[PDB]
Amino acid sequence: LGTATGFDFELIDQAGLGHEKLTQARNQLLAEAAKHPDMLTSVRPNGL
Amino acid sequence: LPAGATQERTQKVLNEVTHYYLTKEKNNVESVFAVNGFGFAPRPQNTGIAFVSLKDWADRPGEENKVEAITMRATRAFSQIKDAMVFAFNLPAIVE
Amino acid sequence: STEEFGKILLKVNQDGSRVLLRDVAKIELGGENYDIIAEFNGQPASGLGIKLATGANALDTAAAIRAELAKMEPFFPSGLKIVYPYDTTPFVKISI
Amino acid sequence: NKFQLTPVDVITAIKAQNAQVAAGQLGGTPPVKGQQLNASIIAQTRLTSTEEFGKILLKVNQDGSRVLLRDVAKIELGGENYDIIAEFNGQPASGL
Amino acid sequence: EDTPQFKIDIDQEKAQALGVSINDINTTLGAAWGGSYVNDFIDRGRVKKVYVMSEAKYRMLPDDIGDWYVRAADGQMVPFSAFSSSRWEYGSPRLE
Amino acid sequence: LGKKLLEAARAGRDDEVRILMANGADVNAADVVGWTPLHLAAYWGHLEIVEVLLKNGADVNAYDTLGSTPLHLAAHFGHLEIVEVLLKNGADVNAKDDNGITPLHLAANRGHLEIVEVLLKYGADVNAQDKFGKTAFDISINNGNEDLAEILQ
Amino acid sequence: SDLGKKLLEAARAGRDDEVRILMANGADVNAADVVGWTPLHLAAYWGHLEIVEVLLKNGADVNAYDTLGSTPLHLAAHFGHLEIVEVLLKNGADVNAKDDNGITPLHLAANRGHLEIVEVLLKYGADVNAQDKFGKTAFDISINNGNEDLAEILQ
Amino acid sequence: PGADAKTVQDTVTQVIEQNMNGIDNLMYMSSNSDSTGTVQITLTFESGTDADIAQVQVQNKLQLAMPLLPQEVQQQGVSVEKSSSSFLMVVGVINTDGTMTQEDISDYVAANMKDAISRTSGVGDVQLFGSQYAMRIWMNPNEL
Amino acid sequence: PGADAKTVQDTVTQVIEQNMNGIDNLMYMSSNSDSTGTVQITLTFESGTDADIAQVQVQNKLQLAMPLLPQEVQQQGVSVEKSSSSFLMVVGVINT
Amino acid sequence: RYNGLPSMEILGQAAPGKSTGEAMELMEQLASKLPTGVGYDWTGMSYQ
């Protein structure tokens, strides 16, 4: 079940961008989510 | 086409089939998707298939503008093509 | 890349000179096979010939395919477009 | 022992001389545009008789005299195993 | 229907005499004229196949067979014409 | 027209072969591999067509793009009547394909003893060697055909 | 140090405003991980120009070498970061710096076909005849790669 | 790859066919061996047969034949599918700006579209009208 | 054994993922390739799917890919199991 | 990888007093302003 009010999001490389570009895009999304503490809490990568 | 016939010969015949539907059947045929080296399964060089989509039934009034009459006229026109078994067919009610 | 395959070292000659793969072969990014060539109303095209799994619903499967294609469209290169040249499901929907 | 051979030499010979080789095509895809000839290349096929297996060439001696498989072995059609023998009322028989 | 096919016979004695392995003959013929799936590579993040094959222009004509050289144990390059013979025959392009 | 003759010869359509040559179809018309109507009749063993083609001035020594003549095909596939008809119409009994293989070499390899005797009778060279230096006798010994080996001394 | 390790993560991540605060608090600019990579190494690799400039202003070793002898200019040149290559060379980066393999920034730039960087390195006095452990020059690399543009520049 | 009709039949088709036994509710079995280097063996089952079990049973018998098959045939992949013979639909892909060739579109469809459509529930078989790109080493005999 | 994340992904994970076709009631598919020398592909199915039919269909399609995996991976074996994250108990065994 | 494409899993939760649906809506908004060829999807608890 996980946590209630908790979400499970997948960022997908749809055009053979590669690992490096998808990381930069992930960092870009995580940075913007951190500017909305009013709405989003503990938005983090599940991976390494 | 008979086995031994080249990919170029099959495209030549597929062009004639595509030409017919785009020119002689403007009012009935919407699109033609022709594939070289394919029948019901892959079969390089001597085999081709054409998927024909007609315009809406409303825009095709009368019996002569329906699939049966269209495929009859098509098969008759394509009978003239040399060294090629070319026929249009409406896939049945129960195809099986 | 072709460049990397091109500089594959086959042998070093007795005088120290190198024989690369590009010295004995043309290296290009081409098809697994060259058997199947498709056209849409005369234009260069590819596509997917989809067959219904035994006992599966045609309309539900068609809907599930369109849902999956809808996911892909936003990430297409410039100009690439999906066309619907052959579908047996519209008639089922409309006839019913 | 007389011809200085082992079962390894016999097995190697059978594999090389009882082979079914895929040898490709003349004018296969992708062709040079304008190719007329499209023919399958037929190399080695499986041996079909004891006579063909018998004349499998194992080696040629220094004096040009040839050692065939039939010179070091008996060749005949015989059971995969000789383990199961049936009789119907004392009469030689097989069954399922 | 049955079609003309290019029957080629590898002379085992002559190949043995010149020191040319039958595995090298079969691989050279198959790879060049039929194509050979070697291994996989990564094209823009996706696993895809690597194929070796003759450039179209060297697998179009019957006489091109003799342009393909196999290296013997002694290191001498041997043309296919040295250890092979060919003739035209008829066979099935599709056995049911 | 020459295309319809090749197909008619292959299929064994006796009547069709005559009708096409009554309209003056090329008797020496060659397909992509260089096979004449006489080649196809010799291969598929259509005796009646071989006779009809030859009397209409068919090249008896026509050779394909690998040097094989109709006598090569008839001798190889055991068509005795066709081998006899061909040889009587001045077919080269010692004819060599690009590999140096002769009608005797082929007939010998498949063990057609009746045809071997006909070829020998029409002046076939028993010592004729292919590109690998093999005679019809060398083939008879290798195949283990003891009946054939005796005929070839 | 605590801050030294925080600066490594900041320089890598490209967190300009965090690096700004760390430089003010005096986070060790000569801080190094197990492989011997300084904050400047990381910034040069990941291509963070402003942090490269800020670190060099705060007395970072421009010729800091990892445990295999690679400098920030090696990383900048190899991964096509033109602006960082220029900034490094202006702050006295050794243009002819050899790693443990004898590989120079010119070798790495040539191998990846970075034409602009090659011309910048050649301008700052990159030894065009410099050989690695395999006796290979940047020219030998250009010929082997089949880079006709680069092969011309190095002639 | 590069096999004639007889080579395919006598090294693949016959080997698989001889292993097709202990299969419930089988009406008949038909196969083609083409000079395109292709075989297709269709096993037709009694009406009301579970298509899941039918596939499982055919697949169970195929795995016994797999090690006997040539290594080149194994590496091409031997698929077992439970679908209609006819097409449900054709999804055509074109470039309206004419910036991509027939080969470019075929590769994109193969690399970006085909897989997801093939895994969709109800899709028994997906045929690419074209080829996925491969690294093509076009050999020259004169230079070799 | 001794494989990095990319080696696992590009020689195992991508090959298996491409062959997970024609399986019924698949909602989504996820995978991890890591430098412990490990891949785990989780296929999640529609609620009410027979878990045995889901497993056998995945397992069967994995054999489509098994000959395309590295010899070292074929040797270790590729486990297909019904996923469960609930243990009845953990029995610990210690030496005092 | 997610559905055969390179992916990166991101976990997070709706802030105190906010619903999971609202937190998901913002994540979709933020995700639609990422570089070209970067898609997204909902998995696990978020999917169902």
Every domain of chain D and the residues it spans: 1-79
* Partner C, chain H 47-86, Cβ-Cβ below 8 Å: 51, 54, 81-86
Sign for the pseudo-dihedral over CA of D38, D39, D40, D41:
negative
Contact F118, F108 (CB under 8 A): no
Which chain D residues are Cβ-neighbours of F65 within 8 angstroms?
A: none
Chains J and D touch (3+ CB pairs under 8 A): no
Angle between helices F80-88 and F113-121 (to 10 degrees): 10
Cβ–Cβ below 8 Å for E43 and C32:
no
Instruction: Rounding to the nearest 10 degrees, give the CA dihedral for residues G97, G99, G101, G104.
Output: -30
Is H31's Cβ below 8 Å from some Cβ in D?
Answer: no
Q: Which chains touch J (3 or more CB pairs under 8 A)?
A: A, C, H, I
**What backbone phi and psi angles, to 5 degrees, belong to B32?**
-125, 120
Cβ–Cβ below 8 Å for C39 and B34:
yes
Q: Taking CB atoms and an 8 Å cut-off, how many pairs form between chains A and E?
A: 7
Task: Output the DSSP codes for G7-76.
Answer: HHHHHHHT-HHHHHHHHHHT--TT---TT---HHHHHHHHT-HHHHHHHHHTT--TT---TT---HHHHH
Which chain E residues are Cβ-neighbours of C29 within 8 angstroms?
A: 43
Cβ–Cβ below 8 Å for I30 and J1:
yes
| Nearest Cα residue to J38 out of A32, B47, H136, I79 | A32
Distance (Å) from the alpha carbon of B42 to chain H's nearest alpha carbon: 9
Helix or strand (DSSP H, E) at B5: none
CATH number of D1-79: 3.30.2090.10
Strand order of the sheet with strand C25-31? C25-31, H133-139, E46-54, E36-43
Cβ–Cβ below 8 Å for E6 and D40:
yes
Q: Which two tokens stand for residue I10?
A: 């590009």
Beta strands E3-10 and D39-42, pairing class: parallel
Pick from I20, I25, I64: which is nearest to H77 by CB? I64
Which chain H residues are Cβ-neighbours of B31 within 8 angstroms?
A: 92
Indicate the resolution in Å.
Answer: 2.5
Count Cα neighbours of C56 within 13 Å in the Cβ-side half-sphere.
28
Contacts of D33 (CB under 8 A, 6+ apart): B8
Distance (Å) from the alpha carbon of F99 to chain E's nearest alpha carbon: 6
Which chain D residues are Cβ-neighbours of E66 within 8 angstroms?
A: none
Contact J31, A11 (CB under 8 A): yes
Which chain H residues are Cβ-neighbours of A15 within 8 angstroms?
A: 112
Q: Which chains touch E (3 or more CB pairs under 8 A)?
A: A, B, C, D, F, H, I
Q: Is A44 helix (H, G, I), strand (E, B) or coil?
A: strand
Taking the C-alpha atoms of residue J43 and residue I42, their distance in angstroms, rounded to an integer, is 12
**What backbone phi and psi angles, to 5 degrees, belong to G94?**
-65, 110
Q: Is H97 helix (H, G, I), strand (E, B) or coil?
A: coil
Q: Is B25 helix (H, G, I), strand (E, B) or coil?
A: coil
Contacts of G94 (CB under 8 A, 6+ apart): G63, G71, G73
* ∠ CA F35-F38-F42, rounded to 5°: 95
Task: Output the DSSP codes for chain F.
Answer: -HHHHHHHHHHT-HHHHHHHHHTT--TT---TT---HHHHHHHHT-HHHHHHHHHTT--TT---TT---HHHHHHHTT-HHHHHHHHHTT--TT---TT---HHHHHHHHT-HHHHHHHHHTT--TT---TT---HHHHHHHHT-HHHHHHT-
